Structure formats: C-alpha cells, structure tokens
Symmetry: D3
Subunit: 117 residues, 6 copies
C-alpha cells in the first residue's frame, strides 16, 4: 500500500477511517456546542480525506488491469465510494457516513475475492 | 480540488510534478554519485506521489458520472496514468517519466473539453 | 522546486492555490450556513498555506542573488504576497484573495523574465 | 483515534504498517540493487513511523489510568513496541520487524481485553 | 528526535507549541467573532497535536529504560501531559493550556537532569 | 508562528532542526555503512526542510515592514540562511551544517532586538 510495492493491503484502513467519520456525525447530533461542532467538522474532514486516500491507493496500486475487467463495476464502485466520502465531509447526517461504509463493504468483498483467486 | 468544493481544478498540478519526476530521472542518468543518487531517489518518490494524488483528485472529485459516460475510456486512462507514475518511482529511466507525462497529456485534453462543454 | 535541485519551477503552483483561496471566499459570500462556513474556513486555511509555501520556495530556491540585484523590489514583493495570503486566511472578503493574486501576478512576470536572460 | 474523541480505535492500524515494515525487510534481503535498497529504506522508514504514531495514539488517547492500573506492564510494553519499530527502521533484518509485531500482538490482546470489561 | 538517531532533543519543541495553544485560548476570550473562533479552534487543534507529537518522541525515542528506572513516575507524567494537551484541544479555557505547560515543565526538568548525568 | 496569529515565535525552532542537520553530518563522516548513509541522507533532508520552513515563517509572518526597514540586510540574511540549508541537504560535510547555524544565529539576534523594541 506504500508503492514499493510491499504486497500488504487491507480495505480495513479505509474502513476504520470511514467508521470514525460516521461516529463523529453521530456525536455531532448530541452536542450543539459551537466549539465542539467546529472541532468535529475539522476532524471529520481529516478522517474522510484519509479514507479517500486509502481507497485511492487500492484503486491505483492494488487492483490491476485484469481486476477491472473481471469486475466491470469496480471503477464505478470505487469512484462512488470516494464521492460518498466527499458527501460525508459536507454533511452531519450519519446516513452519509453509512453510505460510504456500504460502498467500502462492496469493495472489501471484491478485494478478498481477488486475494483468494 | 480541495473538496469544499472550490470549483478550481487544473491538470497542471499533476503535470508539473510529473515534469519534476522526469527531470530528476535525467539528472540521475548524468551523476552516479552515491549521495546524489540517494537524494534524487528520495525526492523523485515524493514528487511522483504528489502527481498521483493530483490525478486521483481529478478522478474522484472533478470528473462526474456524465463525464465517464461520455468518455468510456476515462477510468482506465487515469488508472494507467497513476500506475505509470508508480513505475516511474521504481525507475531511473526518463522514458518512464515521459510515459506518465503522455498519459497526463491525454487526461489534460479530456479535462479541458469537459470545461468548454 | 523540490530542492534536489530538479530545475523545474512554475509560479502556477502558487497561483492555482491562491485562486482556490479566492474562489472559496466568493462561495462564502453566498452561504451563511454554519457548517459550510466552518468547512470553507478550514479548507481556505489549508490552500492559503500551500500558496505561501510555493512562494517561499520560489524565493528561497529559484531566485538567486543576481535576481535580487536586477529586481531590488523582489524581496519586498514576495514578502507582501505571502503576507497578503495570511490576510486572506483571516478574511472572507474576496478582495483579500484578489490582492494576493495581484502580487503573485507581479512575481510571475518577474519569474518569466528571469527565465529569458 | 482522532482525538475528538470519536471512540473508534483498533490496533490493526499499527499492525498493518508493521506488517509492511517486515515485508519490506524480507524483500530487501533478496534484492541487493542499489536503487531498490534506497526506495525500500525510504518507504520502510515511513511505514515504521506511521506504526509508531498509531501506537502512541493508543497509549496517549485510548488507554486511561484505570487501564495502566490493571496492566502495570502496559507503559513498558508500548514503549518497547515503539522502540522495536525504531530498531526496525535501522535494520534490514526481518527479525526486527517481527519483534515489533510480537509486541503489537500483546498490545492488541490487552486492547481487546479492555473492550470486554 | 528524528529517529536516525541524531542525538539531538529539546523539550522546548513541545513547550513552544504548548505556549501557542495557551496564547490562542487567551485570545479566544477577547474576540467572539465567528470566523476568528473557527480559525482559533482549527489552529489550536494543530499546535496541540504537534506538542503531543514532540512529547511522544521524547517518551519513545529519548527516554530509555535507565531513565524510567531512575524516574518511576515518568511514564505517568508524559501520559498525563499528552492527555492535558487533548483536554486543551477540547477547551477555550487558558487553564487547560496552562496545565499542559506545567507538565511539560516537569518533563523538561527531568530531561536536563538526565542530560547532565 | 501558526498564522492565527498567535504571537508566539522563536528562532529556536529553526536552530534545533539545524543542529540535528549538523549532528547527522558528523555521524555520516564516521560511519560509511551504506544503509546508514541512506537513512542519514533521508532524515537530514527532512530536518533541513523543517529548518527552512521555520525560517520562512519568521520571514513571512513574524518580521513586519518596519523590521525590514530597520534592518535592510534581513531579507538577504534569511535568504542566505535557507540557501545554506539547501546546501547542507546536498552535503555530508558538517561545515555546511555549521554555516547554516551561523546564519540562524545572526537572525536570532535581530529577532530578539525587534522583540525588545
Ligand atoms: Ni505498501
Ligand atoms: Ni478544491
Ligand atoms: Ni524541485
Ligand atoms: Ni478518533
Ligand atoms: Ni532526531
Ligand atoms: Ni503561531
């Protein structure tokens, strides 16, 4: 995942950050304090960006040309996933964070399928 | 390009970093000094990574569904471009840096076409 | 611009980031939503910092003693440009982003003139 | 793990980076090419640093006084873990990468035990 | 402090950032403007994080087993110091920034004592 | 130094990093091990870059127009200091690291004079 290549990848990296994004959105609903809202937004932005980065790495480094042919929907799937994260950045609604997680789950399923192949 | 969204994008960002990658490769081909080789390698790795990031942003943030439908080869094009940058990281051959630049030129063409549309 | 040196420089890196700064300020004029204002501020802060960095690099790495001699006002100009960016970080008024862009245009003109000699 | 706090933590973050560190060391033993050795060193340094960061976060943010009371060896264990990672940075011997992984596994075991109580 | 190791360390790095944290909190009390509060919060978050990093480095890299043996309360002290910084991130009260500074001063004293010996 | 502004600055930040640069060069002169030379070069590059950044901040943020009027050679001094750091990046000779330290010491003196003004 470091581009050496090292041969070590795991959608878990993207997933954990996306989980923080949703968890933060849930907390933003229980505290309307201005400064908490600012910190939550700041931090959510950072974790969502990291989640996007991890997915980008899987897309550009892990997945090889043949994978996109075996899974015709893969390109679209990853693109929708990063866009869902961009949407989560601009929202306090936990549903947006969950949508990103749902796409990540689909990518994770394909990831392991290609690993066992 | 910052995901606000700000509406400001330019493949030039990716291109300038990719140009540094090739320039460094050419300089490495002319100075076999150990420490220069180390520094050149370290720095080439950083600039190539930045180039990959910029391309990832165009793909994930700027380009929208309509664009991918109008340009069915766009997904693969950007993917091959970033993969070319990964190959440039692992090489001192300027040809690898040029390959990355050629792909970026193709992405640049498509980018501006979508801007005028 | 990487300090190898690589021999590749372009004021465009600073300009593009400064354009994002102003573009963000313009979007802040149209929407008073709290979370949008927080995100806009956070991201504007980040792009203005990158813009200052790119200018600092031109100043520290690209421009040489002969350049400061030929253009006695260069030091002041670059210093005013980065200070203008600091002012843009602290403002939502597009006029501040415009002022930084104007200074950058002056630096850009001098830059290309030095590429001619 | 982001200090909001968000309530999301997992030693897996540290483990994955540590796994990359060991994997890189194994590759370095089999390929003596100078440029590969340089790139592998650069990247290993980066992943080991990330691994240390993740462990530092668990130690500073996740673990609380009651935990250090229940596990009087915890401070020492995490300190040994990060020191093991520093040792891996300075080594091409996969054994150092494995030692770090051994400590991370012990930290992981304690982490999950605190999730049961 | 860079993990080479270079043999150069100074608690002053953590202190200077902690001083900014407090100074920002002091300023937050004299200006209730929304955008200033947002920027102040964003920046305080960043400086507090850097302060935590510097302390983490002293703990993980500089302090060695003999030091922890000579100062049995050191682990707790550094851990409380970073936790104090996390508390400072979540507060506008200068008292939180002060508490972090006080722990840092304690660490600084111990640091120089181990340097004389 | 964080651009809030926070009112906290100290040339010591630049000095400490520059000290690491020289300390690393001294170590490089004594240990010819290939892997150590690689890691030392990689890390020296990073610390020198941080030193340059700290100096750039004093120049762009701390020093104001009146300061440059009172000390006409300040622009040149800082510029020479950062260029000396770039030279240190490209050298293993401790003398280059010392030259940067000498310039920083000159800047430090002017800095404290402006503080007392
Ligand atoms: Ni990897
Ligand atoms: Ni943008
Ligand atoms: Ni360069
Ligand atoms: Ni967190
Ligand atoms: Ni160090
Ligand atoms: Ni500051």
């Amino acid at each position: 995942h470091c581009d050496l290549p090292c041969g070590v990848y795991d959608p878990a990296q993207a997933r954990i950050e996306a989980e923080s994004v949703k968890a933060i959105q849930e907390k933003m609903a229980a505290n309307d304090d201005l400064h908490f809202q600012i910190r939550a937004t700041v931090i959510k932005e950072q974790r969502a960006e990291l989640a996007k980065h991890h997915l980008d790495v899987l897309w550009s480094d892990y997945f090889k040309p043949p994978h996109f042919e075996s899974y015709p929907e893969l390109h679209t799937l990853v693109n929708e996933a990063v866009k869902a994260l961009s949407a989560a950045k601009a929202s306090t609604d936990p549903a947006t964070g969950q949508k990103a997680l749902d796409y990540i789950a689909q990518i994770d399923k394909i990831f392991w399928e290609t690993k066992k192949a």
